[PDB]
Every structure is written in C-alpha cells, then in structure tokens.
Design an enzyme around this catalytic site. Structure first.
Site, mmCIF file in Angstrom:
data_model
loop_
_atom_site.group_PDB
_atom_site.id
_atom_site.type_symbol
_atom_site.label_atom_id
_atom_site.label_comp_id
_atom_site.label_asym_id
_atom_site.label_seq_id
_atom_site.Cartn_x
_atom_site.Cartn_y
_atom_site.Cartn_z
ATOM 1 N N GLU A 61 -2.622 23.536 44.617
ATOM 2 C CA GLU A 61 -3.255 24.681 45.147
ATOM 3 C C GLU A 61 -3.937 24.379 46.655
ATOM 4 O O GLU A 61 -4.682 22.925 46.725
ATOM 5 C CB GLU A 61 -4.982 24.560 43.971
ATOM 6 C CG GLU A 61 -5.692 25.643 44.289
ATOM 7 C CD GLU A 61 -5.405 26.939 44.452
ATOM 8 O OE1 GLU A 61 -4.428 27.113 45.435
ATOM 9 O OE2 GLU A 61 -4.854 27.900 43.278
ATOM 10 N N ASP A 89 -1.149 24.810 39.853
ATOM 11 C CA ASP A 89 -1.856 23.959 40.620
ATOM 12 C C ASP A 89 -1.949 22.361 41.074
ATOM 13 O O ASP A 89 -1.912 21.897 41.417
ATOM 14 C CB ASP A 89 -3.764 24.077 39.620
ATOM 15 C CG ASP A 89 -4.146 25.464 40.218
ATOM 16 O OD1 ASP A 89 -4.222 26.145 41.170
ATOM 17 O OD2 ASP A 89 -4.704 26.513 38.693
ATOM 18 N N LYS A 115 -3.614 33.875 30.599
ATOM 19 C CA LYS A 115 -3.006 32.971 31.599
ATOM 20 C C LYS A 115 -1.054 32.827 31.393
ATOM 21 O O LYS A 115 -0.680 32.427 31.739
ATOM 22 C CB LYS A 115 -3.483 31.915 31.856
ATOM 23 C CG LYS A 115 -3.048 31.226 32.896
ATOM 24 C CD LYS A 115 -3.588 31.273 34.659
ATOM 25 C CE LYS A 115 -4.916 31.398 34.810
ATOM 26 N NZ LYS A 115 -4.780 31.535 36.745
HETATM 27 MN MN MN Z 1 -5.583 28.246 39.049
HETATM 28 MN MN MN Z 2 -3.428 28.211 41.453
#
Ligand code: MN
Ligand code: MN
Ligand code: 0N8
Length: 179
Positions: A61, A89, A115
């Site tokens: 990320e 991430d 998610k």
């Molecule tokens: Mn995330």
């Molecule tokens: Mn992300």
C-alpha cells in the site's frame, strides 16, 4: 479536517495521501473524510509492519499502483504463492501470504464480510481494525503479537477521540456508510 489531518499525521503520510487523491482526481479539501481515511489506513499499514522484524513484511500500500503490481508479481514468481486478484496491503514473508488490512468506522465483522467478498482473493489474509478497540482476522490468526496490535487499537481509539473532540467524528463515521 485538513487542520486535523495535518496535526495528527506524519507529514509523509499526509503527503502520500495528497499524492494518492490528486492522482485519482479528488481534492483533499472537498473529500476530507476520504483524506482522513486514507491517512488512517496508511498509518495502520506502517504500524502493522513495525509489528514484525525488519525482514518480515513488504508494504504494498501507498506506492504507485502499477509498480506495486510488479512487486506482487515478483513475489509470486519467487515464492510460488497464488497471485491475488486485488492489490493487497502487505506481504508476510514469514507466513508466505498476502494481507489485506481494513480500518472501519462500521462493525468489524460486517466490514470483513464485505472485504472478503470484494477482494475475490481467497488466499489473502484479512485483518480488520475498528476505532472502538476491536479487531477481527481470518481464523482468529492475528499475525502480530498482542502489544503490536494494542498500539494500533490505541492509536485508532485516540484518533477517534481527537476527532470527536473537534466535532469531526459523526461526519467521518456516517461517510463510510453513505459510501
Ligand atoms: Mn486495506
Ligand atoms: Mn490497500
Ligand atoms: O480500503 C482498503 O483497505 C484499501 O486497502 C484500499 C486500496 O488498497 C485502494 C486505494 C485506497 C483507497 C481508499 C483507502 Cl481509505 C485506502 C486505500 C482502493 C481499493 N483498491 C486498491 C487501491
């Protein structure tokens, strides 16, 4: 919110968030909840990293997206790990698995479900944090030691209090849901 974000976050986080928003053609000064959410999420990813040794994590990320995919490709070629369909991430070099980190002003568990459904990558490990001291992770496998996690939960509770104190919290909470 700009006054707040600029007071509460490391300028490099602020700078990465600004860079991410203009790049997506959003204006940090109109989309102030988004700006704050970006900052908060980045911060967590860094704190999550700082939970392991220096060999442990690759932070994906906060990096140019195109480049970031190349890193995911190099990892997947080098290790044999399945390629995620959605950009994660972190990569965890101990567990050999990608991680998705979520930061939510809604309940941890509904946000997990959403998610899980959204990322369409069954092998990515999911770890969700709230601003109420809660967390949920795939298989109650929380990856980091307890102290590392308390530092995250504490920071998020702190942010929420500092927002609330400036009358910023309600707007920030309800904006996720409107999204
Ligand atoms: Mn995330
Ligand atoms: Mn992300
Ligand atoms: O929402 C998250 O946990 C998150 O990890 C999102 C991202 O990785 C994307 C960029 C991003 C967008 C919003 C936020 Cl708050 C943080 C990052 C959006 C979804 N896609 C990939 C880029």
């Amino acid at each position: 919110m700009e006054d707040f974000v600029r007071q509460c976050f490391n300028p490099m986080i602020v700078e990465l968030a600004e860079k991410a928003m203009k790049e997506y053609g959003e204006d940090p000064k109109i989309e102030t909840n988004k700006f704050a959410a970006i900052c908060t999420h980045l911060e967590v990813c860094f704190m999550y990293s700082d939970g392991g040794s220096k060999h442990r994590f690759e932070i994906i990320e906060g990096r140019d997206r195109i480049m970031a995919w190349t890193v995911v490709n190099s990892i997947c070629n080098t290790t044999g790990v399945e390629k995620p369909k959605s950009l994660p991430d972190l990569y965890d070099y101990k567990e050999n698995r990608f991680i998705e980190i979520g930061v939510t002003r809604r309940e941890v568990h509904i946000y997990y479900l959403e998610k899980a459904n959204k990322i369409k990558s069954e092998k990515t490990h999911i770890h969700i944090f709230s601003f109420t001291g809660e967390e949920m992770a795939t298989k109650a496998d929380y990856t980091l030691d307890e102290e590392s996690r308390a530092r995250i939960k504490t920071r998020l509770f702190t942010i929420r209090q500092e927002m609330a104190s400036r009358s910023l919290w309600d707007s920030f909470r309800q904006s996720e849901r409107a999204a």
